[PDB]
């Protein structure tokens, strides 16, 4: 049993070949080191310390070459020799990472046995061309009615989730992943997403709850969890987005779509700060490195939609930046905003107000406008944007105690009902078929006849009404994904039959 495992391992070990490089360690400690020698060393290549540590190499000098250790620094001694592996850093990619956790370097840490490898890839691949790219038209939803409704979520776009640490930052991402169940089941793989969740700077227990959540709701069967917990090395936290991107890219090549969550880039940055200052090279703004921008921008332009001479794939990106006691003008936060094409800003105060999932519609922007909302969903949310933007001016005037006319109070009365409709329960998937009815009601003024407290009672009941009677209305929406003349009328009648309660 145990005797056999150990004897196999002795057979599996030892007997090294004639070496063609050397260098002698000197400085060493912090997970970081500096060696004297090394003239065949490549930048980013892997060097094998004779203690059992491996360290990639990021700075070369004609003095002392800086090889950043991965492994524990307590193993490493000075005056050891190191041997260049002779290959830059790479991971195996294959369909055997499905329903399993893998770490920084791409080996499983969940003990679910060896992965299935159909290729190897490299962590740096970079963005595809202008000609092998096509434009994004590709509907997708997050299972939050609010987010979908107000901002145009696509497949192949990058949208930055920003706001304060531990406000269910992770939780916001988890709702989207749960809701990505609906397309995965569907037969066609031109719909399927094999979502990859990257977790940097988080404790092991956070990750361990999250995998239980995923399996319980029967969503762990296309998901991949990549990890680099906060104890694990400063290089390995840096390598965690780049190797997630290579896993994501393999689906893209095959002509399948997937989605990449980078939670949090803010902690990747902090790692790189520790690394850059212990290679004692100048940082940029607020101690964060000078080449930190190069890291986020290169990465982010790889989640891209492909044209029809390629797979016709698209990796989608959601960055997440937790602002430490706010600040949106802080160096890592500013850089990422510029790189992303939209913001889905999450506001802390509104959480206590009872507007969970929390969003603030002015801090959330779309530069190029709507182009990735489901067409049905576009028709209903048509004046939703204009109402809510107006409600914010009117409300601020309204509560002062001053005198108001009936015209200003149509906005207040109208807005209050709209905001209350947005409220949803976290960890609850949603479908287009059941967000089209609710926005119609709200826009077309049938939620004013219904009292503010019972708007929540109403929602669950209205959709149930339809299951028994106007089950035809729901099917047309699922099947055609648009509202014609007939569908508007059908729905106008469907709202009327049940307005009560």
């Amino acid at each position: 049993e145990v005797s056999s495992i150990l004897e196999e391992r002795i057979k599996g070990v030892s007997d090294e070949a004639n070496l063609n490089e050397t260098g002698r360690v000197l400085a060493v400690g912090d997970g970081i080191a500096r060696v004297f020698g090394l003239n065949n060393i490549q930048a980013e290549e892997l060097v094998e310390f004779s203690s059992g540590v491996k360290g990639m190499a990021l700075n070369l000098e004609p003095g002392q070459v800086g090889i950043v250790l991965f492994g524990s620094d307590r193993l490493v001694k000075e005056g050891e020799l190191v041997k260049r592996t002779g290959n830059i850093v790479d991971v195996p990619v294959g369909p055997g990472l499905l329903g399993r956790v893998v770490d920084a370097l791409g080996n499983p840490i969940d003990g679910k046995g060896p992965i299935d490898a159909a290729g190897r890839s490299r962590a740096q691949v970079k963005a595809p061309g202008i000609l092998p790219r096509r434009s994004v038209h590709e509907p997708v939803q997050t299972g939050l009615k609010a987010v979908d409704a107000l901002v145009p979520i696509g497949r192949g776009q990058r949208e930055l989730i920003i706001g304060d640490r531990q406000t269910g930052k992770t939780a916001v991402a988890l709702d989207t992943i749960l809701n990505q169940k609906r397309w995965n089941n569907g037969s066609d793989e031109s719909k399927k997403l094999y979502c990859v969740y990257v977790a940097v700077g988080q404790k092991r227990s956070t990750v361990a709850q999250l995998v239980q959540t995923l399996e319980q709701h029967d969503a762990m069967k296309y998901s991949i969890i990549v990890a680099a917990t906060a104890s694990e090395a400063a290089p390995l936290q840096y390598l965690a987005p780049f190797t997630a991107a290579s896993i994501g890219e393999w689906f893209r090549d095959n002509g399948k779509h997937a989605l990449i969550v980078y939670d949090d880039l803010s902690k990747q940055a902090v790692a790189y700060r520790q690394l850059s200052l212990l290679l004692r090279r100048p940082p940029g703004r607020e101690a964060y490195p000078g080449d930190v921008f190069y890291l986020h921008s290169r990465l982010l332009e790889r989640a891209a939609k492909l044209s029809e001479k390629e797979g016709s794939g698209s990796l989608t990106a959601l960055p997440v930046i937790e602002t430490q006691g706010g600040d949106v003008s802080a160096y890592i936060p500013t850089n990422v905003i510029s790189i992303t094409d939209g913001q889905i800003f999450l506001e802390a105060e509104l959480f206590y107000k009872g507007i969970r999932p929390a969003i603030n519609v002015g801090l959330s922007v779309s530069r190029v406008g709507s182009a990735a909302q489901v067409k049905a969903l576009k028709q209903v949310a048509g004046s939703l944007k204009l109402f809510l933007a107006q409600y914010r001016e009117v409300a601020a005037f309204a509560q002062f105690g001053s005198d108001l006319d009936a015209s200003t109070k149509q906005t207040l009365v109208r807005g209050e009902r709209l905001t209350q409709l947005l409220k949803q329960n976290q960890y609850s998937p949603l479908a287009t078929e059941e967000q089209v009815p609710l926005i119609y009601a709200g826009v077309n003024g049938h939620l004013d006849g219904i009292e503010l407290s019972r708007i929540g009672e109403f929602e669950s009941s209205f959709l149930s009404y339809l299951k028994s009677n106007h089950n035809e209305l729901l099917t047309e929406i699922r099947e055609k994904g648009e509202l014609s003349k007939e569908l508007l009328a059908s729905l106008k009648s469907a709202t009327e039959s049940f307005v009560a309660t």
């Binding site: 290549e45 080449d291 094409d341 406008g369 944007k385």
Partner: protein, 470 residues
Amino acid sequence: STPITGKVTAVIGAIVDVHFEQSELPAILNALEIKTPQGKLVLEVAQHLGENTVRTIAMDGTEGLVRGEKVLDTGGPISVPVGRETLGRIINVIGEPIDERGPIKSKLRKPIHADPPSFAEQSTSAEILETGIKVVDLLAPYARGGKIGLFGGAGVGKTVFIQELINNIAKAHGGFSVFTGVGERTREGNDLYREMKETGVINLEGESKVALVFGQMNEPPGARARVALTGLTIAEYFRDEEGQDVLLFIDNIFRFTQAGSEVSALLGRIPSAVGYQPTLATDMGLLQERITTTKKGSVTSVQAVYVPADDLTDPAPATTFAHLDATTVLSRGISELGIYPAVDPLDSKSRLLDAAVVGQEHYDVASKVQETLQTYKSLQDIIAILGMDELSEQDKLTVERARKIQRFLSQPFAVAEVFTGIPGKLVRLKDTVASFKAVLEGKYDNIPEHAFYMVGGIEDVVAKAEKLAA
């Protein structure tokens, strides 16, 4: 100076130091080429550190670099291609296309270090651009020979704005445009490529009326920086030898700034106030000064700028405010209300607003417009706190004239048949001045606010009245 062989000594990311053999070194600002398993790595020489040790800024992706890997010297600076045949063609940092058209068809090549034109060559701008965008035409007139500046914050419809100007004006004129993109996304580049082939502005048969220089953010901070320089040189060939006026565009110019800040730090230089370069002034100036009206031809930039958080106490946007003649602010708010364009015209100031340039009549109409709107903005606090107190018939009439004007700033656009689906309209300079004159006089204070919604001229208001009647 001359082709020599040096060996790499230190690779510190983008930063690459070389140790050329004794008495032999390249001069400052040259281009070194180093053989790499990823295109041809170009290194821009930026310092001497003594004993024939140069320190360079990268222009192409770094990876797999050995210390000891041979570095040739071109003998001169990075030399791009220019011509009236590179129009439609795409060019980047090392002058290669990234939509895979292979080697550029070159008439002539030129250096990207072109020292600025002198004061002797100067001429005074008197030619007047029309953008055909009413809020812009009336409240901050542009003049062709100008250095226009599209100040705005994040996600405010800057790309959509540039897309309308290029679609309309480039075809209209018999001049050229070169559209230059500094450190911007491959989603945007692919949209900007697709939409402008469709409209007939960029066309493969025939000579394209706007060239492209796509420099994108996946490339090095160094490599991104000197993309802007690359575009300028094409505009300079047009200005000089071809003798044609240029209608320049650069997009977004904060990307230019941000890149120089980063590389200032890596070179070892000491950063200035609020994380900005110490060399901030001169770098903007170099580009702006080259873009100018000479008796050779003009160069007229229209420059997008990213202004962090609608903040202008931040030094990098505020320094840039000086260089730019006829500012406009694309406020975030204006866009959301459903008013296209996103321009807020009480924060736009122009130096091209005289009263005999654009005539007396233009200045005076806009002056009344400025006041009329701002009194209404002033009364908002007053209704907010007091209620319906401290008002007058005079205030009521101003509030009403202003709300009619406020909804009279929206002009649909063809390149937003993708955002709202409402197609374009073109409004002449003389036409906007007249239509705004009519409202002020109060002849069109009987036509509802939403009957100025998504109109152009005067004809359009009367017609939108019939719709609401009907």
